[PDB]
């Protein structure tokens, strides 16, 4: 499973448009060997297209039925995430002296350790803009199956079709079929 | 009706625009130049004046010729996340130093973007600055007379509500409404 | 009783030791050396206040049955509120900063505490002072309700201690033998 | 033994020094006026040496031998209070660039004084970067083999605890203690 950290370049997805924003030393390959970090966001943010087009048709496919949708309840963000993720590196990349940005991206490493989970880093507060949602789904053919949070992009009522993709064996991605 | 969603949340922030032109205006007549120099304590009090704006229009949207008296069955007290206030204000407070344009515009489109993120996810009221300008949540459950029932409504008002007495409502969204108090 | 102003500068008592060796500029000296540095001496006269408000908090009771005694577990958003900022805002070197790090000092006041717990800061715990949580009985009808005590000393399950009220939620209390 | 409390609250405050020790560093036959300029990354490195060495301290005091076993009756996780952090780190990241030597001291005594309530208000096992060097919270119900049984004491603890498995008491106060895995 490649697209795990496909996920998580679309998981920031929008922090590289304000480094381009930010970091732009524009007034010839002189250029080019002036800013560099625009070129390298530049590259991730088109990664990041071609990510979400590979989450936008990763779910049709053949794949012959989950489930009819059991119980489930929303889940909701974390907005520690986007405390971690999102604000401290936008306070790294804009100090200029080379020698606070290596500072705060440190203490983002330091909060990414201790403050958060390894396994909810999925859950950006900034993956909401291209019209995603978390519904935690008690599926139960294919057989019992608790604690799968599914990203989905349309609400989720009960007893209904629904076609699946697997990202992990603690989240995956489902589409309704109607 | 979005409008006012998104206004709760300009709302939530006027004593950002407060901090900011506290933190950046360079006051020592002059017409041009103190235009000039001062482009973003202008452009916040701009902001200000809008907040203030939407505080008359969150004040005056309750009596909108409707009458209505839905009763209350269960209210209970919901209070705010606290880290909303943390995503918002503790940007001009890290050593942010307001000298190009160019990351007033990245602070600017930081802004919009957390906006537009806050208005997706339901969190427009979750800041706490809005019991700075009065206002206190409450978990509620109305009745709706005659015609149905609700149920896990969040409410704001700026007055306490009691169990068992009648209001008016002003909805935002299926989920979020505004209630005040009869007399 | 007037005296919720004097647990408060002996809450800040630490703080204005802070503000004598940050901001001031003592390099021959006149006035002109005075009348510079006015906020370390309106600090030096708090201090002088904290010092006589110590001596007065040692005796203000003067010349009871205990039941409940629970832990009461210091709030340290306070020390974020009324201790880190302030020494924040003071050493900036120009004063718009420290006048926007008191105006958020006033905001992380009245939004985040919900200001009638101010008492518990935690640089009390500093000067000796322990709290406990109290229901107390007497013959003096014994009527006041989930009450919180802020002693020098520990306290126990029927415990001889003389009450000094100081609001609804406080007083001040020690052990009798 | 408040030293070996001391001596983990300093441990808790690494990363503070290793920030210090990148935030201020003057990178620029004679030169050996470096010292005297660069005189704040030279104390914390001093303090960051001293801090490792009560690091390797507290890796070995279980490992002082006198048959100790005792059955552990329920495991819990109690988890760091996140306020702690806010309290000993956001001083060199909410502004304060370093300069001349009364600041530093200011700096010097607030760290000592941060200490001094730490230790006595009891939550100097409060700061979540001790999850940094590896240290898991579990409130543990713990019963002596002896002259009687002690309730809700904190461990911190290397090891992830389960249920009914021996400890090597290391008692600080009579509260906390520091254990490892039996093998
Ligand atoms: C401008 C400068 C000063 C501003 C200060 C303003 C206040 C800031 C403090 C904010 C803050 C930590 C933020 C940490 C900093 C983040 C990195 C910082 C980066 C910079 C370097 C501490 O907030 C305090 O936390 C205390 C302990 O949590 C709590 O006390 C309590 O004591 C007793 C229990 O011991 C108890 O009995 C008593 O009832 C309480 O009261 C306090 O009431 C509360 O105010 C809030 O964090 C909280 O905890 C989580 C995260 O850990 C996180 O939510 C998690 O849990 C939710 C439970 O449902 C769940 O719903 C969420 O899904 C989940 O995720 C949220 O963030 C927030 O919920």
Redesign the pocket.
Known sequence: TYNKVGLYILSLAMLFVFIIILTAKIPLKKLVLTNIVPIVCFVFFLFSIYFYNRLKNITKYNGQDSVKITSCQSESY???TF??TYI?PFMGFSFEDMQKNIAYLL?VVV?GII?IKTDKYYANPTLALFGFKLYRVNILGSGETKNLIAISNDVLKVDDNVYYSFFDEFVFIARKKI
């Open positions: 974390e907005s520690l405390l971690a401290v203490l909060i403050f």
